[PDB]
């Protein structure tokens, strides 16, 4: 996160850390959607062009974390993965279209003050909230500049109009993505950066006071560059595949 702030304790109890064993290291962000399911970006696990292709044996999920580096002895819970599911149509060849994956934990996590699931949007919620001008929130332990924080960082960014998104890159944008950030004429700045991938873009419904995950940190060219925007996986658009896997497994 660039131009973010330290998160408050218990601010994003769904925030999950993807962590590799050997070498021990921070892979990506992720989100807790239930006691047994985690949502992340597919590119966190598979990206052939960088020879990236992780299996369940390769990683650990760290939940209820605040500190990037510390083993939060009485607070975090660490889980092993049972199985990984990448969208059958994730396009790592071209534009990271459908950048989403599900991870099934070996055992369910008990909730706590620091661990709690985020809601997945419904058609009406997605409809009311996914509006240009509307602000969402991103969190991660990623790079501070296009440099590593000691604690989870947070930033609030407005959804940008689809035309603007399209005109800011040479990359082929799809309906499965949305962009967010401030424009050069608004004087505020901030963005996600490497290390933040797989993290949630959340919005708080004004109807029911609940937090919903609308996006997954996906891609961007550099970080917090003027006239550029961060791209996120459009969660609602991929909801049927999510549901499909959950019911099926």
């Amino acid at each position: 996160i660039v131009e973010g702030s330290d998160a408050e304790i218990g601010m994003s109890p769904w925030q999950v850390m993807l962590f590799r064993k050997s070498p021990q290291e921070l892979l990506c962000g992720a989100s807790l959607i239930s006691d047994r399911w985690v949502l992340t970006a597919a590119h966190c696990l598979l990206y052939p062009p960088w020879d990236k292709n992780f299996t369940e044996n390769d990683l650990l999920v760290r939940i209820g974390k605040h500190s990037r580096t510390r083993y939060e002895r009485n607070i975090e819970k660490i889980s092993m993965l049972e199985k990984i599911y990448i969208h059958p149509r994730y396009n790592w060849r071209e534009n990271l279209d459908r950048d989403i994956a599900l991870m099934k934990l070996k055992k369910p996590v008990a909730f706590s003050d620091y661990i709690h699931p985020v809601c997945l949007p419904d058609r009406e919620t997605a409809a009311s909230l996914l509006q240009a001008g509307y602000k969402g929130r991103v969190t991660g332990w990623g790079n501070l500049k296009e440099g590593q924080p000691s604690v989870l960082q947070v930033v609030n960014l407005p959804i940008v109009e689809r035309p603007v998104c399209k005109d800011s890159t040479r990359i082929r944008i799809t309906d499965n993505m949305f962009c967010a950030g401030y424009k050069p004429d608004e004087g505020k700045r901030g963005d996600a950066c490497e290390g933040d991938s797989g993290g949630p873009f959340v919005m708080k419904s004004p109807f029911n006071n609940r937090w919903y995950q609308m996006g997954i940190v996906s891609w961007g060219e550099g970080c917090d560059r003027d006239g550029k925007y961060g791209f996120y996986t459009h969660v609602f658009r991929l909801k049927k595949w999510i549901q499909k896997v959950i019911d099926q497994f």
Binding site: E8, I9, G10, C119, K135, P158
Partner: peptide
């Protein structure tokens, strides 16, 4: 279920330091 309601916030009726920014944009 009980999704999206944080134990240390919504459940206790406390607001985080910048959530108002979000709500104000809606």
């Amino acid at each position: 279920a009980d999704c999206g309601l944080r134990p240390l916030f919504e459940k206790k009726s406390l607001e985080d330091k910048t959530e108002r920014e979000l709500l104000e944009s809606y």
